[PDB]
Amino acid sequence: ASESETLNPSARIMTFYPTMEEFRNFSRYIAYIESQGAHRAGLAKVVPPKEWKPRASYDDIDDLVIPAPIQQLVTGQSGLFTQYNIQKKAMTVREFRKIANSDKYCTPRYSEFEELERKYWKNLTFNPPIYGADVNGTLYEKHVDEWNIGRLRTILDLVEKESGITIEGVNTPYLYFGMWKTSFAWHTEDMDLYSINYLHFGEPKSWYSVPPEHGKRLERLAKGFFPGSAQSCEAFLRHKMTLISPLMLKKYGIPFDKVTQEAGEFMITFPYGYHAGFNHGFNCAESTNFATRRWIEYGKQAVLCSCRKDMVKISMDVFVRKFQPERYKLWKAGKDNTVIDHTLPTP
């Protein structure tokens, strides 16, 4: 407890309301929320100054093409499930919005979130919804320079700068069109990077998050529930097919917090922060990964999936060399035994 641990001790999901002045410098504001211990929860919400907008209106996107929509079939019981993504032929936002609003895939009625949440976990294996996910592109207007997911200017840019390598969705923007019951399984970002998520419009998106500080406990639980998957790939959670309900988490003592993201709101996940969730109804979100100096250690130690050969792999070399010159030689000879303090901020 050296002042680092005395900040956000409960490691709960914090919400920030930055002035246009603070909102202007992305990397600075991130370092700030971390100074407030936001990273402990693994997830943070950031409501942008009310007069800020990245687009005039979205009446034009009804034409946009979702080249690879996916149908989410879920199999499981008792709070433990495996999600299988079936790919469907391309479609336009209108065709998607049509099915999303249809009485068949429409959001059910309810009073309090607590009830909408109970219905999610009761019916996620029924009526396989369609998710227009991982669509390359952005909805930000070319002139927006504040928190533009298309050009955040973090050190993650070094990947491209140094090698020309493009990793769709990681160092490029991704759009997600969801409907009721579409969901994202438990996972940390590729290479355990940070992620930014802006909900452009539509119904809310709810999130579940486990503090990085307890990430390994979630992995051990997951391994035990799916021993078959764990042995064919240690990092099987990166397959993004595992769903675990909050009740199961509660039952096994795994700390977590929940939050619901509204339209016009930003969500930030931190290195090694496990998260999962679902969409309330029709909506549109844009996202990408980013990095900070603090990420470097996480990147060096990220446990990657090796069973699939198309998984995101980033050479850490350029980062250690440039930001950890004193350790480059040691790390290269695999003798860098740096232990990571999840509560610590980049001092």
Binding site: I167, Y174, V312
Partner: peptide, 5 residues
């Protein structure tokens, strides 16, 4: 290298 999706 790699890709999301």
């Amino acid at each position: 290298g790699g890709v999301k999706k």
